Structure formats: structure tokens, C-alpha cells
């Protein structure tokens, strides 16, 4: 597991404490990579940080906007099982606007369902 087959909630860092042990999708800007390469920090569209942990070290540098799929740990960090760097080579990604989308998702679950309903 392989949460690629599970519903994952799109969150920001202020939601981490409410999603403990839940599959999540966290979009944010790469702030730094830990010396080990097994942890990195992403800042969300409100400028708040989420800590992303990996079971194996990164096999590449990542930067810019990165989207992480993982499970929220007991410590309100994210154990990442996959990630995608968002291409911005022609158009900068508006993370502030993304953040608003996230709040809207959570306010209107009837129009953006999590899983089969």
C-alpha cells in the first residue's frame, strides 16, 4: 500500500494534524533537502511547512513545486510514496491560488468527493 489505489485528500500544512494516518496529497514549494536525502520540507500556499519523509534517499535533486502522495505519520509529517515535480518552464505555478482550491475542496465535499460515494 500503495496508496495509489486509495483516495488521497489534497491538504495544506494546517490540515496535517487533522489527517493523522490518512492518505494525502501535499503540493508545495521545495524549501530544503535533509543531508541524508531521506527528508525534505515543502512550504504550502499559506507559507507553512510540511515535513516529507522517505524510506529511501532521493535519486535526483528536486526543486520548485512538488506534489507528494503519502500517509500522514503519527508526528504529522508525511511518509511519501511518490512525487511529481510540476513543470514551470513556461508558466509559474500559482500556489496561493492552489491553496484556495484546497480550502474549497474541503468546504464542498458534495461537489468533490473523496472516494466512491
Amino acid at each position: 500500500v500503495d496508496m495509489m489505489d486509495l483516495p488521497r485528500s489534497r491538504i495544506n500544512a494546517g490540515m496535517l494534524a487533522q489527517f493523522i494516518d490518512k492518505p494525502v496529497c501535499f503540493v508545495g514549494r521545495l524549501e530544503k533537502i535533509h543531508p541524508t536525502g531521506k527528508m525534505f520540507i515543502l512550504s504550502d500556499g499559506e507559507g507553512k511547512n510540511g515535513t516529507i519523509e522517505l524510506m529511501e534517499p532521493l535519486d535526483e535533486e528536486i526543486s520548485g513545486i512538488v506534489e507528494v502522495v503519502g500517509r500522514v505519520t503519527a508526528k504529522a509529517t508525511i511518509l511519501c510514496t511518490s512525487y511529481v515535480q510540476f513543470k514551470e518552464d513556461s508558466h509559474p505555478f500559482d500556489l496561493g491560488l492552489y491553496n484556495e482550491a484546497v480550502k474549497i475542496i474541503h468546504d464542498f465535499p458534495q461537489f468533490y468527493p473523496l472516494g466512491i460515494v
Partner: protein, 129 residues
């Protein structure tokens, strides 16, 4: 009779849709032609078609089938798909008439907004009962 919209949806909406009077419906919103935005997880190349597993986080990846006579869109690419919702043998799938890789990821954020606004407004128009 009668207007037919390309409704932006999530996969969770497509999977939850039920056939009512021979047309798919999610909530009180009728869907036949839809758009989704997600990431290619898998591409299955055959001579007559490509079948992609497309993932938008809202559920398990959905099968999206595209007709062959452009190469396969590489995995880990975000795409917008426009297609017809099918359920062949009780298994949901899309038959794509458009698959476009995203160059501007703001189009992905906009789709989220569009899904929610489209479903909110279409449900109100249909209700009524």
C-alpha cells in the same frame, strides 16, 4: 431538446455515477461527456488503441482508452482528458476524444475549481426535484 455539456468531473464522481433512465448521473447532474485532469500512471500500447491508467487522487486510477490509426504520453505526465463515460461489464472507463499533456499546471488548479463550480450550478439547475 437539448443542451449537452462537457462536464468537468473527478474520477470519484465518474466511479459513483449510476445509470438513470439510460443516462449516467452523479447526484442530480447528468454526465455523458466529461473532462478529467490527472497523472498517467500506466500506458498500455496496442496496435488499435492506447489504454492509460489516469490518477487524480480522488480514487484509484481510471482506465482511459484512446483510438490509434503522436506517440504515447509518458508516465508521470499530467494530462487533461475529454471523453465519454462508459461502463462495459460493470467496469467504469473513459473513451477519450482528447488527451492533452499540461504545460501550464495552473490549468490543473482551474479544473478543480471548475469541477466544483460546474457541479454546484448544474445541480441547482436540475433541482427542481
Amino acid at each position: 431538446a437539448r443542451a449537452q455539456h462537457i462536464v468537468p468531473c473527478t474520477i470519484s464522481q465518474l466511479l459513483s455515477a449510476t445509470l438513470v433512465d439510460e443516462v449516467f448521473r452523479i447526484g442530480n447532474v447528468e454526465i455523458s461527456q466529461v473532462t478529467i485532469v490527472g497523472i498517467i500512471r500506466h500506458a498500455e500500447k496496442a496496435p488499435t488503441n492506447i489504454v492509460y491508467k489516469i490518477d487524480d487522487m480522488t480514487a484509484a486510477p481510471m482506465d482511459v482508452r484512446q483510438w490509434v490509426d503522436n506517440t504515447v504520453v509518458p508516465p508521470e505526465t499530467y494530462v487533461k482528458v475529454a471523453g465519454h463515460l462508459r461502463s462495459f461489464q460493470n467496469k467504469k472507463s473513459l473513451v477519450a476524444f482528447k488527451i492533452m499533456p499540461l504545460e501550464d499546471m495552473n490549468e490543473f488548479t482551474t479544473h478543480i475549481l471548475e469541477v466544483i463550480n460546474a457541479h454546484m450550478v448544474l445541480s441547482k439547475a436540475n433541482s427542481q426535484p
